[PDB]
C-alpha cells in the first residue's frame, strides 16, 4: 500500500487533467487518483505497481516521480 506523487506538466486545464488520469485509471490496485493543476501534481494511492504508472504516463508527456512511500 503506497502513495505515489507525480509531476505531470501536461496537466494545464480540466481536459488535460482528465487525459492524464485516464492513462492510469485502468492500472490494477489503484484506490484513488488526485490531480491538481496548482503544482501539476498527481497523487495515486493503492497497491498498484508504480512501474506501470510510469510506463503508462510516458505516452502523455514527460512526467517526474516526486515520491513513492507508504500510504
Amino acid at each position: 500500500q503506497q502513495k505515489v506523487v507525480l509531476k505531470v506538466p501536461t496537466m494545464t486545464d480540466e481536459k488535460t487533467k482528465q487525459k492524464a488520469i485516464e492513462a492510469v485509471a485502468d492500472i490494477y490496485g489503484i484506490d484513488s487518483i488526485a490531480a491538481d493543476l496548482k503544482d501539476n501534481k498527481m497523487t495515486i494511492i493503492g497497491d498498484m505497481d508504480t512501474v506501470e504508472i510510469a510506463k503508462k504516463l510516458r505516452k502523455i508527456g514527460k512526467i517526474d516521480i516526486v515520491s513513492v512511500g507508504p500510504a
Binding site: 480540466e14 487533467k17 482528465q18 488520469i21 485509471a25 489503484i30 484506490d31 484513488s32 487518483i33 488526485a34 490531480a35 493543476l37 494511492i45 493503492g46
Partner: protein
C-alpha cells in the same frame, strides 16, 4: 459500467474542477477549499457521502466513471 466515483468542486460541467477519482468500495480524503473531506465511494450511484455521516458541502459533486 463504473469503477470510480469522480469528485468535483462544482456541479456545472463548464466550470467544475475535478478533484479525485475514488475506487468504488473505498474511502479517500479530499483536500479542497482549505479543508479535508473524507468520502465513501459506495456504489455506482456515486452519492456524495462523508464518512462522519454529515452533509457534505453543497459544492462537492460526484459522477461515476
Amino acid at each position: 459500467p463504473a469503477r470510480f466515483c469522480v469528485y468535483y468542486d462544482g456541479h456545472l460541467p463548464a466550470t467544475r474542477v475535478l478533484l479525485m477519482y475514488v475506487r468504488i468500495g473505498t474511502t479517500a480524503t479530499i483536500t479542497a477549499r482549505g479543508h479535508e473531506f473524507e468520502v465513501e465511494a459506495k456504489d455506482q450511484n456515486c452519492k456524495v457521502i462523508l464518512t462522519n455521516g454529515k452533509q457534505a458541502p453543497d459544492w462537492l459533486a460526484a459522477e461515476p466513471y
